[PDB]
Design a protein around this ligand. Structure first.
Ligand code: 8DG
Ligand code: NA
Ligand code: NA
Length: 156
């Protein structure tokens, strides 16, 4: 069996738009995404998600809601990425560019799927329907999915 490392992913989803950030360097650079990163020792997953949102987008929220979990496996990488996905609709400041991310709002009929991780085409629609989900995706490199599972769940 493989070990996994905890990561977070945060989507600010409002009734007509979603906040994404263009990843400027590092993992997933060049793709629009939610905000997030590695959970640190001692913090809850939700608190790590709140922290990453603030660090990468400038937004401070008091509460996030867990909407899904996605496990990523890469060919040649023994460690799995266990990504805990959170949403909120409620913000009260403006996003600001960070070293990691350039935030930008997208209308919900203009989700930039071609410039997002390929797996997002499968699970993001569930997030938009306010459904909860568990997923797993195995990648060869950055572009090619070799195997995946996706299921709606009632509890994440
Ligand atoms: N939408 C989407 N997000 C993904 C996928 N794979 C994946 O790791 N993520 C998310 C989880 C995290 O938010 C981010 C990966 O973490 P990261 O490398 O940015 O972590 P970090 O901020 O701690 O890294 P760093 O600043 O130290 O370089 O990308 C995917 O296929 N789709
Ligand atoms: Na980060
Ligand atoms: Na990050």
């Amino acid at each position: 069996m493989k070990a996994s490392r905890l990561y977070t992913l945060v989507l600010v989803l409002q009734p007509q738009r979603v906040l994404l950030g263009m990843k400027k360097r590092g993992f997933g650079a060049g793709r629009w995404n939610g905000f997030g990163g590695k959970v640190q020792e001692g913090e809850t997953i939700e608190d790590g998600a709140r922290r990453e949102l603030q660090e990468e987008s400038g937004l401070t929220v008091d509460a996030l809601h867990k909407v899904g979990q996605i496990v990523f496996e890469f060919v040649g990488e023994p460690e799995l990425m266990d990504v805990h996905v959170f949403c909120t609709d409620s913000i009260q400041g403006t996003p600001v560019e960070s070293d990691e991310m350039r935030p930008c709002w997208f209308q919900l009929d203009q989700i930039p799927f071609k410039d997002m991780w390929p797996d997002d085409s499968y699970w993001f629609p569930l997030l938009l329907q306010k459904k909860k989900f568990h997923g797993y995706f195995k990648f060869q490199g950055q572009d090619t999915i070799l195997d995946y599972t996706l299921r709606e769940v009632d509890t994440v």
